[PDB]
Amino acid sequence: EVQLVESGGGVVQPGGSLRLSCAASGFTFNSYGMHWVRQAPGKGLEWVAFIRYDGGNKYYADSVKGRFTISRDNSKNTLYLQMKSLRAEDTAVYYCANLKDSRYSGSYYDYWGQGTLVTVS
Amino acid sequence: VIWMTQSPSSLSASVGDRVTITCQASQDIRFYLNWYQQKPGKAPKLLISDASNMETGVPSRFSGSGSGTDFTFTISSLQPEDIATYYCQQYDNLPFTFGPGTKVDFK
Amino acid sequence: YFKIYSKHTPINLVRDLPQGFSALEPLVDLPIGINITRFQTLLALHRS
Amino acid sequence: FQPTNGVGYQPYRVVVLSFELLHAPATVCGPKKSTNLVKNKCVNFNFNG
Numbered sequence: 001e002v003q004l005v006e007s008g009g010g011v012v013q014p015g016g017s018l019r020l021s022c023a024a025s026g027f028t029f030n031s032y033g034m035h036w037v038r039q040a041p042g043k044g045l046e047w048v049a050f051i052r053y054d055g056g057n058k059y060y061a062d063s064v065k066g067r068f069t070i071s072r073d074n075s076k077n078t079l080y081l082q083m084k085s086l087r088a089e090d091t092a093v094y095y096c097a098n099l100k101d102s103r104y105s106g107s108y109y110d111y112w113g114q115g116t117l118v119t120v121s
Numbered sequence: 122v123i124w125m126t127q128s129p130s131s132l133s134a135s136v137g138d139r140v141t142i143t144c145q146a147s148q149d150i151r152f153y154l155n156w157y158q159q160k161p162g163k164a165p166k167l168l169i170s171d172a173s174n175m176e177t178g179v180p181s182r183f184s185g186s187g188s189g190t191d192f193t194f195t196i197s198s199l200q201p202e203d204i205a206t207y208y209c210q211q212y213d214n215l216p217f218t219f220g221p222g223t224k225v226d227f228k
Numbered sequence: 229y230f231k232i233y234s235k236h237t238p239i240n241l242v243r244d245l246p247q248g249f250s251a252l253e254p255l256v257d258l259p260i261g262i263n264i265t266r267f268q269t270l271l272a273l274h275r276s
Numbered sequence: 277f278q279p280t281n282g283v284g285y286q287p288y289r290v291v292v293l294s295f296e297l298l299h300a301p302a303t304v305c306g307p308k309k310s311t312n313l314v315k316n317k318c319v320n321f322n323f324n325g
């Protein structure tokens with residue numbers, strides 16, 4: 001029932017920008033906080049950002065702070081990641097996810113999308 | 122920031138073998154550690170939350186425990202279907218971090 | 229402090245919430261000192 | 277212990293009251309003293325803080 005669908009990937013040049021989105025359905029999107037996670041080819045999982053259920057407080061990884069912005073539209077059940085001044089090091093598959101977290105998001109269930117590839121070169 | 126490490130980075134085992142993966146934190150994450158299993162081409166699947174709480178649908182052969190800085194993930198009887206890279210995630214404080222990941226291969 | 233407010237009113241509607249305004253009065257304030265991030269509703273089941 | 281033991285040898289009961297004050301809601305407080313209520317006069321007052 002629960003689905004998360006990333007889109008907006010593709011190939012961009014260094015110093016450019018790209019906005020990702022994730023469509024959520026099958027659950028009460030506006031009740032959960034959401035995360036972005038990226039995985040570069042040949043690499044493990046890197047946490048990128050988190051936004052609270054109300055779209056208020058925002059958190060980012062040190063590797064993206066000052067360049068990436070996280071947002072959400074709770075009327076369209078869509079999560080967004082706005083990345084600007086992307087570098088070659090930012091090439092990765094970007095996922096939207098609802099990560100089980102007993103301390104912050106309060107999520108009791110763990111959901112992941114499919115992942116969208118963003119290439120910078 | 123809390124740094125996470127895993128050991129071994131890679132292990133090989135056969136069917137029925139006991140497989141253990143060690144994950145360490147540079148700080149005290151209490152019991153706040155998620156264990157994920159990722160197979161090629163797929164998003165990570167959560168197997169264990171809060172250090173030792175098994176997720177619904179996860180086979181009884183999977184288990185884990187630990188507190189503070191030292192955590193262990195165990196498979197009591199490795200199956201052909203358990204070949205994957207396992208990750209630990211800490212969520213004591215933001216930013217959240219994942220360990221390097223431990224690859225389990227087939228002997 | 230775990231604060232609970234409550235109100236009890238009659239209703240003649242189904243499958244929805246009523247229109248109109250009604251304020252909830254404070255019920256109890258518990259000096260507990262714990263963290264809450266998740267909750268679950270408890271239902272009663274009969275052994276029959 | 278024996279009933280005929282000297283003062284320093286006799287048994288004594290000890291109770292120790294440890295007071296914990298952390299960054300948390302208080303659970304134990306001493307009693308509050310109240311005075312009589314005065315009306316129709318200029319007074320200072322304190323009603324439950």
Ligand SMILES: *[C@@H]1O[C@H](CO)[C@@H](O[C@@H]2O[C@H](CO)[C@@H](O[C@@H]3O[C@H](CO)[C@@H](O)[C@H](O)[C@@H]3O)[C@H](O)[C@H]2NC(C)=O)[C@H](O)[C@H]1NC(C)=O
Nearest residue numbers: 103104122148149150151212213214215261262263264265
């Ligand atoms: C309820 O949740 C709050 C918020 O997460 C918890 O507060 C956190 O408590 C930890 C310690 O248990 C704090 O970590 C400490 O930070 C200081 C300063 O950097 C450092 O010197 C210590 O070594 C330790 O890392 C954490 O900062 C604090 N978070 C906030 C926002 O204040 C609280 O403990 C939770 N309650 C319970 C019962 O778990």
